[PDB]
Fold this sequence. Notes:
Two copies of one chain form a homodimer. Chain A is an alpha/beta fold and 168 residues long. The first copy, chain A, has a single domain (1-168), classed as Cytidine Deaminase, domain 2, CATH 3.40.140.10. The first copy, chain A, has helices at 8-27, 51-54, 61-73, 91-99, 141-167, and strands spanning 34-39, 42-48, 81-87, 104-109, 134-137. In chain A, strands 2-1-3-4-5 form a five-stranded mixed sheet. In chain A, helix 1 packs parallel to helix 5 (141-167). Chain A is elongated and about 60 Å long. Chain A binds chain B through residues 51-52, 54-60, 63, 66-67, 70-71, 73-78, 90-96, 98-101, 114, 116, 120-121, 123, 126, 128-129, and chain B through 51-52, 54-60, 63, 66-67, 70-71, 73-78, 90-96, 98-101, 114, 116, 120-121, 123, 126, 128-129. Bound molecules: zinc ion (2 copies). Chains A, B: Pfam families: MafB19-deam (PF14437). Chains A, B: Homodimer. Chains A, B: Zn(2+) binds at residues 60, 90, 93.
Amino acid sequence: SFLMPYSLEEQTYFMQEALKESEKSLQKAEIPIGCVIVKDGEIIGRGHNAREESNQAIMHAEMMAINEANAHEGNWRLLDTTLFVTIEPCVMCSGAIGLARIPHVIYGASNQKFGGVDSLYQILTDERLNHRVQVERGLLAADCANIMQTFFRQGRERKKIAKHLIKE
Amino acid sequence: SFLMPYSLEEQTYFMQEALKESEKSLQKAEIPIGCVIVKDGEIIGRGHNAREESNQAIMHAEMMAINEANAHEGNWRLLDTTLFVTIEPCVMCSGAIGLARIPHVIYGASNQKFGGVDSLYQILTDERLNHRVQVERGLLAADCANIMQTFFRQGRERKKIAKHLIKE
Ligand SMILES: [Zn+2]
Ligand SMILES: [Zn+2]
């Protein structure tokens, strides 16, 4: 039943690759969330949040990775694939993951405010939608949560500078 | 509380425009669902399902329309906008609609199998996500449901021809 296509070291490698995607968003002053989609032990799609830069509301890490994975495979179906994402996917991405037919998802830290996999909803395991995704969580959670904390602190600092310049 | 930026005739015009988008998908042998996003009485985004053609799993009508609307406005935020879609948005699109901050959504026929607005979930009015979208349904439902029925019949016919050619 429970599948294990990759060792813990392999999984760690992939999540760290997603964290590197996460760093791209951070550097661009955006929610530091990264994602990588793997097929046969090879990453076929990468993504990071880029809503502000792209001016696209759907441009979350998972969506970018899915588009890349589909392009790579030249198919909207992403069977026998594993998706690694630093933070629990929101409702939109969860729905997208189900539509892509991705059977395996591994995320780092949970998303208590917008989480659609375990937190607010359980879209990837919902029988009505018949999504039967094997979900794993906790992989490098500390790091995934840490870069997010860095983002928020930097955000307050940027907001403080802006407030100062507007004033006088 | 309840807003009415457009008359019933204006709404009908926009849904018919979404039905025209729906016809594009039908012609390409895809789920005939169309969508239009309106701002200040003007359509700023159009979309239709094109998963098979684009090989993109997220390429539903609403997603295509949102990307177009964001591009038009050069902003991921789609405030003071109204989205018209022939069929009740699925979970992915509903989530996307919430992320775009679209305050008004009008759909034709309901989606009893994958509906994320009223059928399976109520994402657009979920307090946890604080989405406070004004939802209207039923606009030209008969037509929206009709073109879908046409799609399924044509699908069976295409499947029958394919079965015949494979055989002998
Ligand atoms: Zn998301
Ligand atoms: Zn959808």
